[PDB]
Amino acid sequence: KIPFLSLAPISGALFIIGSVVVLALANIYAKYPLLHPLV
Amino acid sequence: IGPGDFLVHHAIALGIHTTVLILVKGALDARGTKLMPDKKDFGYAFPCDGPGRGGTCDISAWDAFYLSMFWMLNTLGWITFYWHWKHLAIWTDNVASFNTNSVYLMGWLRDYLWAYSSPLINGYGPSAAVNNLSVWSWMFLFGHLVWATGFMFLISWRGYWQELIETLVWAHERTPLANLVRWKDKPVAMSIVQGRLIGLAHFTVGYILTYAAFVIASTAGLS
Amino acid sequence: GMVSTDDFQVGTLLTPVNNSPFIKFFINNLPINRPGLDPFFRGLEVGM
Amino acid sequence: QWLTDPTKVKPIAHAIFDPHFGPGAVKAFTPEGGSGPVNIMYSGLYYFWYTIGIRHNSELYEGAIFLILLAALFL
Amino acid sequence: AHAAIFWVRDYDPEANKDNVLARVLAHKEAIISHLSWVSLFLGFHTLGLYVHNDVMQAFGRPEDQILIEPVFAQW
Amino acid sequence: TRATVDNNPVPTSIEKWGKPGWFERSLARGPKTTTWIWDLHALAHDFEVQTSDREDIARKIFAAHFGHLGIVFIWASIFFFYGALSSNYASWIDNPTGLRPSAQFAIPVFGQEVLNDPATAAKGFEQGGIVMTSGLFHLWRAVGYTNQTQLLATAVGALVAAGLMFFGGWFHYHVRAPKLEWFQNVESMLNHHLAGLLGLGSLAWTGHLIHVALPVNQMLDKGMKAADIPLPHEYAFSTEAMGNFFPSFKQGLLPFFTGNWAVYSDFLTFKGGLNPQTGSLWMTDIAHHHLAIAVMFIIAGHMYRTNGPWNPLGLGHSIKEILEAHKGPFTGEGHKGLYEVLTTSWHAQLAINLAMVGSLSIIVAHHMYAMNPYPYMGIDYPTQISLFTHHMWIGGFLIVGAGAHAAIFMVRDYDPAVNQNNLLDRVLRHRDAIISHLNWVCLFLGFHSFGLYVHNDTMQALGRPGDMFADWGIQLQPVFAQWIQSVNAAAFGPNSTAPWVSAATSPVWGGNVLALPATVAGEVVQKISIAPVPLGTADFMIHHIHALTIHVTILILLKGVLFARSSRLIPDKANLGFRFPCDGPGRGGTCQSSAWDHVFLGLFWMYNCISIVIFHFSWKMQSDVYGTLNATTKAVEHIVPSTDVLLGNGTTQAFTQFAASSVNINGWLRDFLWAQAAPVINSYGGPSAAYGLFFLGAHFVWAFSLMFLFSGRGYWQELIESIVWAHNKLKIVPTIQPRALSITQGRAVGVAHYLLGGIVTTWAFFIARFLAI
Amino acid sequence: PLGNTIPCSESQAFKDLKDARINGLKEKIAATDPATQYAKDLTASMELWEYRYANYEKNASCDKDSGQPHLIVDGRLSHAGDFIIPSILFLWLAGALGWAGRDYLLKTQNAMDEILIDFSKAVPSLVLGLAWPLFAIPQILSGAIRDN
Numbered sequence A: 001k002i003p004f005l006s007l008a009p010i011s012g013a014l015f016i017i018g019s020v021v022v023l024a025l026a027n028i029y030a031k032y033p034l035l036h037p038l039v
Numbered sequence B: 001i002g003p004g005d006f007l008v009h010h011a012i013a014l015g016i017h018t019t020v021l022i023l024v025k026g027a028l029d030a031r032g033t034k035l036m037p038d039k040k041d042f043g044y045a046f047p048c049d050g051p052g053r054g055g056t057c058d059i060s061a062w063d064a065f066y067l068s069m070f071w072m073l074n075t076l077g078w079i080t081f082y083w084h085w086k087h088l089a090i091w092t093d094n095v096a097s098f099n100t101n102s103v104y105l106m107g108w109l110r111d112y113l114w115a116y117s118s119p120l121i122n123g124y125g126p127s128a129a130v131n132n133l134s135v136w137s138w139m140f141l142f143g144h145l146v147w148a149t150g151f152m153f154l155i156s157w158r159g160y161w162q163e164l165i166e167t168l169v170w171a172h173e174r175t176p177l178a179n180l181v182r183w184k185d186k187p188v189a190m191s192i193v194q195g196r197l198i199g200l201a202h203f204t205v206g207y208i209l210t211y212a213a214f215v216i217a218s219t220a221g222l223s
Numbered sequence C: 001g002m003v004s005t006d007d008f009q010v011g012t013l014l015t016p017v018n019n020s021p022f023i024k025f026f027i028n029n030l031p032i033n034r035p036g037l038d039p040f041f042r043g044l045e046v047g048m
Numbered sequence D: 001q002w003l004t005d006p007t008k009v010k011p012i013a014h015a016i017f018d019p020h021f022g023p024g025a026v027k028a029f030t031p032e033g034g035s036g037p038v039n040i041m042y043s044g045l046y047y048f049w050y051t052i053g054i055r056h057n058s059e060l061y062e063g064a065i066f067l068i069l070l071a072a073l074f075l
Numbered sequence E: 001a002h003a004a005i006f007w008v009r010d011y012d013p014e015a016n017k018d019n020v021l022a023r024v025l026a027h028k029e030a031i032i033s034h035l036s037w038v039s040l041f042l043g044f045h046t047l048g049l050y051v052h053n054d055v056m057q058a059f060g061r062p063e064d065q066i067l068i069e070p071v072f073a074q075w
Numbered sequence F: 001t002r003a004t005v006d007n008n009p010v011p012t013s014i015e016k017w018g019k020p021g022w023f024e025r026s027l028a029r030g031p032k033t034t035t036w037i038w039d040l041h042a043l044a045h046d047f048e049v050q051t052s053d054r055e056d057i058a059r060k061i062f063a064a065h066f067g068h069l070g071i072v073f074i075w076a077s078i079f080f081f082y083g084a085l086s087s088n089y090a091s092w093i094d095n096p097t098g099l100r101p102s103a104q105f106a107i108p109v110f111g112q113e114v115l116n117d118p119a120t121a122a123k124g125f126e127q128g129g130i131v132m133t134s135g136l137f138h139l140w141r142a143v144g145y146t147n148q149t150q151l152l153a154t155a156v157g158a159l160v161a162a163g164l165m166f167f168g169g170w171f172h173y174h175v176r177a178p179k180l181e182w183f184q185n186v187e188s189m190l191n192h193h194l195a196g197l198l199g200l201g202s203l204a205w206t207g208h209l210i211h212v213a214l215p216v217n218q219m220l221d222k223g224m225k226a227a228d229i230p231l232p233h234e235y236a237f238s239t240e241a242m243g244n245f246f247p248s249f250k251q252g253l254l255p256f257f258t259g260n261w262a263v264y265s266d267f268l269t270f271k272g273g274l275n276p277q278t279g280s281l282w283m284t285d286i287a288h289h290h291l292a293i294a295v296m297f298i299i300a301g302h303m304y305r306t307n308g309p310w311n312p313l314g315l316g317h318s319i320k321e322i323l324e325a326h327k328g329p330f331t332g333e334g335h336k337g338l339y340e341v342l343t344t345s346w347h348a349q350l351a352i353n354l355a356m357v358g359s360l361s362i363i364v365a366h367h368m369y370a371m372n373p374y375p376y377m378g379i380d381y382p383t384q385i386s387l388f389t390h391h392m393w394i395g396g397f398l399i400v401g402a403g404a405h406a407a408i409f410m411v412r413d414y415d416p417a418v419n420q421n422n423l424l425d426r427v428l429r430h431r432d433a434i435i436s437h438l439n440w441v442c443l444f445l446g447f448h449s450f451g452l453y454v455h456n457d458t459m460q461a462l463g464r465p466g467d468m469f470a471d472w473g474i475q476l477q478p479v480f481a482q483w484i485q486s487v488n489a490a491a492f493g494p495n496s497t498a499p500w501v502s503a504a505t506s507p508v509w510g511g512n513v514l515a516l517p518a519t520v521a522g523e524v525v526q527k528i529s530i531a532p533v534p535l536g537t538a539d540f541m542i543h544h545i546h547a548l549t550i551h552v553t554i555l556i557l558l559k560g561v562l563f564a565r566s567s568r569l570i571p572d573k574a575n576l577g578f579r580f581p582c583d584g585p586g587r588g589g590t591c592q593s594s595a596w597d598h599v600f601l602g603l604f605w606m607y608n609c610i611s612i613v614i615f616h617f618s619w620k621m622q623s624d625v626y627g628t629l630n631a632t633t634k635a636v637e638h639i640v641p642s643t644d645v646l647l648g649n650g651t652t653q654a655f656t657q658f659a660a661s662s663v664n665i666n667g668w669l670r671d672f673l674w675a676q677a678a679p680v681i682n683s684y685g686g687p688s689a690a691y692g693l694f695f696l697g698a699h700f701v702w703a704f705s706l707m708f709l710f711s712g713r714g715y716w717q718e719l720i721e722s723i724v725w726a727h728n729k730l731k732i733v734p735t736i737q738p739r740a741l742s743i744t745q746g747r748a749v750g751v752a753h754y755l756l757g758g759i760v761t762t763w764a765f766f767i768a769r770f771l772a773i
Numbered sequence G: 001p002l003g004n005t006i007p008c009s010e011s012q013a014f015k016d017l018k019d020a021r022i023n024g025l026k027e028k029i030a031a032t033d034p035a036t037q038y039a040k041d042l043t044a045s046m047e048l049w050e051y052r053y054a055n056y057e058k059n060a061s062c063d064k065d066s067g068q069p070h071l072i073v074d075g076r077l078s079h080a081g082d083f084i085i086p087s088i089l090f091l092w093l094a095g096a097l098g099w100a101g102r103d104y105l106l107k108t109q110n111a112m113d114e115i116l117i118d119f120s121k122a123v124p125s126l127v128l129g130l131a132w133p134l135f136a137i138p139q140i141l142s143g144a145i146r147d148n
Ligand code: CLA
Pocket: A008, A009, A011, A012, A014, A015, A017, A018, A019, A022, F034, F037, F720, F723, F724, F727, F732, F733, F734, F736, F738, F739, F740, F741, G101, G102, G104, G105, G113, G114, G115, G117, G119, G122, G123
């Protein structure tokens, strides 16, 4: 257990921020899709 | 039918299901729970069991009726909002307005709620003389007033009004020419369940008259 | 000096709005309080 | 009068006696060819009464008499 | 309402021993928690698709909104 | 005196960071339920329930002040970085009237770049941007910023100042902390917040205006561009450069020491109102202002007596002798005790101080539209609506907190031995008369303002426009307010009551419509910054609405204060505390009897008050002040047009839209709230599309509040009993117990979301309306 | 071509919204300086939007009348990317989060571990969340707990 980053707001809020950044770069890399392309 | 139709049918399923959640919850928990395992001895309508055990506000089955009433009004608002906009878009030869703007909620605010208010709120005005829709204009503002008057009883609760009526009782008994006139029933604040029920009755009456005024004056003011 | 109470349990204050002698002469000789008057005449003068 | 042209002249619910009305509202709730202010019916009773076969105000009057006496029978 | 009024005033668990009414009193948390799941389900997704459609009309992109034909009711 | 300070009370460690809730005894046992989580947040700044020692309490408050001044310097640095890196300030300084001010863009990601307004696109800032409404750039032009690197230097200096305030907090709490005897010498702290904080602050600000801000604004008004001098028109070595701008007296600071003051009558003037060229206050009047109040604040800090090793110094006043000298026969023993009140209670001081700073922010909101301080500021209409609306809302919030901490004093720090026969005691002896008479005057104001509005709705609906309380019907003329407009308009000339004034107090009193050069695409001069603001029947009515809403907010908060300790219902309410939900369903029901609940109710009534104030301002400024001069024959065309009111005889009469339509609720609904919301709902796909999204989201948050406001927690707790059953059936068992929210905290969540949703709806509406026209 | 539904390859209104967006973009490039970071962003938006309308073209998105792409959800394999692939993606990542949190509760059972997150027992909970069906299916086939 490390100081100040093991706390639930920091661990939680960096999970929301890391998720929206990885989702965001998934939207750049897959060019903001509406669906999945099959063809 | 198309995708705004899809979205508002899921809103309808949402409204009916949440209203069923509050009501089946108020039916089956009415005899007893873990917060209150002897609730059936206290009847249908009672305020609470007080601030202990964390606090017991709105614990009666009457209160889950009471809270499901707002959800029924919101549900049936979504139903008649749907019926009204889809039919007014048919009746004004503008079905592309519904098929484009019913999928997003500024279309509901703008192209239904703001757009069709125009013959209603011009029922009376300073520059144009009145027409037959001035009574629905006055009923529209009346229902806004009654609905918002409900919010006083819904938000502000009892012991403020009991202390305020105690100052009023002091003011009457020390005013000359007027302490010679006495009440027979002692002025008290309305009860807890009474404050809920009167706030619901105002909310509900204002809801019905506001929507009835709009659904009649907007459709009669198409021409 | 101006504000006394003369029965301090009773929730009232004896104040120059309350206890000035011409205000007591006015209020105590308004027709509902003026002595020697049958209630009908008190009502009559209040009505007029 | 509504039976002669069903499609343009509006059903009338009842006529208005409000002493609060000024001249604008008296002209407003009066239709064309009307002798005073009325309420335009939006409950659909004229279409109901046409489809069940009422064509006269005297049939509406005997309907009124029959429902008052039927209510008196239930009381 | 009068369902809950029945529950407080008129229900007897002894005459209704292990009939269907006592069994849905017995597993009441299943019915309430599953109505809770249906309500949260419909709300999260209906509000999310609506607010998506709001953001896409806000961002100048009407052809990026999520549009689902109701295929079951047209069937 | 003597600054008696202890050394090292608290060691600097990390050991309490791993233990949340250390500061209160029930929180220190560990989380068992979820209410601990909310009890962790509600008790974090309540230092009086953490430790019982008032000295340590005062040190916690002091270090909290340094940390707050640090965070305010971080915010100050944040808008200085945004004005210094990604702004159009290098091109806004050359076009303050045709270029919309911006210091923020939206980056090329998710389609948000339609939010970039192309009326902010200029050189350097060639992307478009978010138009701001704070008026930072006009402040910055008035104090002399012509360059973005010195804005960067201010940004770095504000971060250094934030670091200094944090090191001051850590030093004055953890290393070397003051005692309780240091805080209670209120005489010296008043003497050094008047003469030193306000006095030398505005004296040094007068120094800034004279050396920097008056010459740079004279160069910007005489027509030269951003290529300026910032270092060679200063100091001793270019003293003659003070003579090249506006003639620095005869020679140097020699006529300051010799006493001939009249040769400085060129950059310390008393000319009067607003400048016609820039629409704002004359900068010489601003400098002579801050110097005269600077002087009178150094006189103000010479009042209270301080004794020490200074020999002849030590003449003056003790505050206690002044307070115990004012007795009266009506008021018993007067202000005795109030010195001990205000030197031992923090909540009483905070109640006075929140009342004064909230009142002062409301005062600020009036006087900055009324006198425009900054160049070309009054023509940028989103900034005018936004700063009036901002300072009104901040003022109302601090007045509700004033009522809050007055009631918190009355719960916690009231001592009956100190408050024997003083004003504070005898207010509590006739609290029924105060609250009942207040209840009567709120009823009178509500009937005789709102029933007038309801009467106007009724008579306009019934076809009786002459029966209306209006300027064309039953006239309600504000004859006292119109007479004070005539007095403040008339008091400038020769043979008046202020003989040496050229251009009066303000043009709002009844003198002249003032207009400014601006582009607006390819148009002509137009742009009324300021005009006379006439008062009629609608102003009578809206001001009695304002008196109503102020008086009900007083009634709620003051009934919270005087009935905090006891009532006829609950005589032991102070033992129940400031913040309790109720005392049970008995005595009929005692719901919302605590004084906290009166802060909770007074928050919505403050919402009512300030919302009708900013609604009056939006429609009023829009209907009678703001607008356009026509290119043919200089005719005034306002932002909303004039209304030809149909009279009862058949003819019309021209009124403005506030004078015609703001007399009933139908015109407020239609011509104000339906008509001007057309640019917040049509804003999609463009630069104001976020304000549409904030409008809809704030409608959501406002309606989301009413779940918490209209319901209560026993419903939610037996619902969470069913959801906890669903979790225990699938072996998903939290040790922290899922609870319903408490009654007080559910009320707090509801008032927070009601306030957030309504004020952000109204913010979105104001900015998205005022960017359009 | 379903009800109120034609594909993108024969839709007139999709061509209208398409060439309306591409034309409004090309006079947005054509009136600006191509070396000022605005116009490079518009050419990136132009290339991005050409392949966005081309991907709506080539995988049979469906429009009719109003021209925007209408998603058909039945379980059709031609329209498999409408619902079925983000279904499997949602059940994978949401079962990862739910199973990771559930396993974190089953290994901690402690009140300090919920507000103060133990990463050494939270990140491998997330790793077994990334393979949650192999640990979740035979506990469905076994049973959870006896409570009423
Ligand atoms: C009354 C209000 C209330 C409140 C305040 C809470 C509060 C809480 N609940 Mg809860 N709960 C409630 C009601 C409430 N509950 C109700 C009504 C129910 C239904 C019965 C539940 C059932 C419930 C369950 C089942 C659980 C909680 C848990 C929690 C805790 C969550 C901690 C957290 O969010 O950080 C989140 C921490 C993480 C996400 C850790 C991962 C972070 C990584 C390691 C950081 C590294 C990532 C890096 C930055 C890169 C980012 C990229 C990314 C994509 C990976 C929290 C204290 C959970 C808990 O116990 O804590 C774990 C839990 O499992 N609750």
